[PDB]
Design a protein around this ligand. Structure first.
Ligand SMILES: Cc1nn(C)c(C)c1CC(=O)Nc1ccccn1
Ligand SMILES: [Cl-]
Length: 154
């Protein structure tokens, strides 16, 4: 009851710290947090980790030209379920064309699941979020904290 609430805030803090580190260095990232709708089919596409959640591990996963970086990290429950997992690309023509594959993958998974997905752009270092087919582009740290707090702490 209260143990899961402490885990969710640790999940939020882990996302904030890792995205800040990667944004400063323009390291692309794609982190999808599953919810009610299971993402088990997409977890199976990646390399399984089943690891404890930490900002340190999230950073090490997305280091460029490493075995674990090319794809999405999926967080299920209180674990980093998989890395290098593949997410469906959205077919939306409304998505801006200056955004890349990570943004299109984050939008695609938000259209068929209720998951919260976070993106770090390797071109601009901007942090974006997707939920329910919508895109919050280049959010600030306050905006990111408010969205994650509302959507991840039940
Ligand atoms: C869904 C899918 N299956 N397969 C074989 C491909 C190539 C895709 C789409 C895709 O490129 N998704 C992606 C790209 C970057 C990060 C995360 N997902
Ligand atoms: Cl990108």
């Amino acid at each position: 009851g209260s143990r899961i609430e402490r885990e969710q805030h640790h999940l939020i803090e882990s996302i904030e710290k890792s995205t800040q580190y990667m944004a400063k260095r323009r390291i692309g990232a794609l982190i999808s947090v599953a919810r009610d709708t299971g993402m088990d089919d997409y977890i199976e596409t990646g390399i399984p980790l089943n690891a404890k959640i930490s900002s340190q591990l999230l950073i090490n996963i997305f280091i460029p030209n490493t075995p674990l970086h090319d794809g999405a990290v999926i967080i299920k429950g209180n674990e980093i379920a998989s890395a290098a997992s593949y997410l469906p690309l959205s077919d939306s023509p409304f998505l801006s064309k200056e955004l890349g594959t990570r943004h299109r993958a984050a939008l695609g998974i938000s259209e068929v699941t209720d998951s919260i997905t976070i993106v770090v752009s390797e071109e601009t270092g901007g942090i974006s979020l997707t939920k329910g087919g919508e895109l919050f582009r280049d959010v600030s740290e306050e905006e990111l904290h408010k969205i994650l707090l509302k959507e991840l702490v039940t």
